[model samples]
Target chain A: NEAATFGVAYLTAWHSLCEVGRLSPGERVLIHSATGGVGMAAVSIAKMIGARIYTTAGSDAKREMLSRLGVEYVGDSRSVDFADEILELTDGYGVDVVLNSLAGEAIQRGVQILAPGGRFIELGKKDVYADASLGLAALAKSASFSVVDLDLNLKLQPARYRQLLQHILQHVADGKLEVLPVT
Target chain B: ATFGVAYLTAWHSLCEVGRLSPGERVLIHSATGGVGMAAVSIAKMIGARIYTTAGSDAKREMLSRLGVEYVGDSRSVDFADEILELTDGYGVDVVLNSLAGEAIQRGVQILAPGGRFIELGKASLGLAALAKSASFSVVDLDLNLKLQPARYRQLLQHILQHVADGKLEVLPVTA
Candidate 1:
């Protein structure tokens, strides 16, 4: 039951990160709050897809954990401007996707650092609902924004979602994909 | 220029084709007129932040009363620069554009990445291409829907749903 439940959450994030962001090998992904459930799940999926990973966490320990997880760039968002760090890391080219869970000003900053034609996935709603605005020009590169809500999708498209989940689990079973370990 | 514009043609292109999501930023050029006002109302229904331009102070004030967040005078002010500053350098997500030439050029420059430029008036296709993959669609009612009755009816049903829910309102015009 526990594994099954975790499967649903991880599958949903994996699907969104792959299908929505169109995760491709060599593409760069920046996962915020990487120690969190969804963030770790996203990192795992990105890794499986052979994407270059960057991540932000609240502490040095979490950042260290992320580095071990194969994230090329790990920053403590509390002290560092993750966006600026990412910009520098990429030499201002920016990342291909941002799996954002941060709130308030961090949301704006994350959006600012997206590469042209990048995709931004919002996993948190409270701060976005509070206030989140993006410069229209930043999206000129055909960037997109989406809020990942697996519950709603499951309710709306039950059959397709079931198949999608089974497919992801199959990948994990085949040793092609990995799920975030429950700590 | 008060053209007897097919406002629905312009409006449907935005809601259905552009797929305007809630909380995105939009710029409605020539916003005091029929089509522009209609676009504004639909943007409100979808929970988008509206930045619009009018020809005069009175019209800008009128647009302000309609609950638009930013109102600019197209004649005197540089709307692109103003909008850039307003959004902290990230441009708008969609533009309900009716202007031509230089104004249209500026509109393309202000679009956010992956933004949609819905041209209700003539626009240079080349200008839209300047923005990396930002799409350009011309809303021609006769071609888009009238030729295909079933599609038109489906879109009409969607719009009617919004109206029934009281999320969308049509502004009355005086002759």
Candidate 2:
């Protein structure tokens, strides 16, 4: 019944993970805020991709719900502590890909935790539209930060829109994609 | 140094955009040109497997003598077919492109999964398909040069140091 409802979140997250990050099997990925629609979808897809998943959620109920996903690491989303947690857990090598939805100084911390050759995908628009600094020190390590605007992608990549749509339907019918819980 | 522009552009594409690593294959187009020659040196220093192209046989000979792993005719698009076969259908991990028009389409074709296509050319074909396999990056040097002096200088110093260490090559110029 929610096929009509869950389209945008899944497609957007898929484009971020599959198309943009090219997140492959065994790569470490951090999806900020597992309580969010796009964040939850990324968790599911990262599972399918066999990536080492790290996610965050703020509230107790939200954290409990996210913990059940069987991800390797779950951190607090209310503060920037998640970056420290993830960095320590990964032995300072940090994650290869960060699907960031947090804004302000959190963006700065996200840049700090990247491993060499890491990718930071900015899914949030607040600071990006302002042309705020994503920090340049990490670029020396060949790290990249991309501010993704999905609507721009739809305009430039209309064919990808179609293929991504098909991918969801195929996965949903096979009982792999968990349709978001009705609130 | 005057070599800053070419080396910086090469460093940005191969290291920044492509994140080219040791043993990964890279196709650097126009190996005899300023940026292309710089890229060959930088990619070599990164320990990447270098595949390159040049328009004239003379330029191709220069690349072979310089010890590039593979050299193909840049005047035609057969380089894609040739390199694909060389990697056993695996294709290249990065493409630092300066090709124009028709060859631009093939530039996107031969990229391996998780590959990055660094478009250094102003002339481009509209790339819209096969977005799931890899990504495209349009390099704008002039824009970054004006706004970000700190990083620009850092990269230049890094490149200059590499040249002094004999790990990189500087194009011979005469005025």
Number of the top candidate by TM-score?
2
The Cα error of candidate 1 at residue B46, in Å, is: 27
How many clashes in each structure? 17, 0
Q: What is the TM-score of each candidate against the true structure?
A: 0.52, 0.55
Q: Write one digit per residue (lDDT tens) for candidate 2, span B1-175.
A: 2477788888988886678999989999988888888888788788899999998877888888877779999889999889988889988888898887667679778877556777777632222322323555656677567756796888888878878888776655211
Q: Return the TM-score for candidate 2, rounded to 2 decimals.
A: 0.55
> Which segments of model 2 are wrong by more than 4 Å?
A1-5, A126-129, A176-183, B1-175
Residue-pair clashes, model 2: 0
Model 2's CAPRI class is: incorrect
Residue A40 accuracy (lDDT) in model 1: 79
RMSD (Å) per prediction: 13.4, 12.6
Model 1, DockQ value? 0.03
Q: Which residue runs of candidate 1 sit more than 4 Å off their true CA positions?
A: A180-183, B1-175
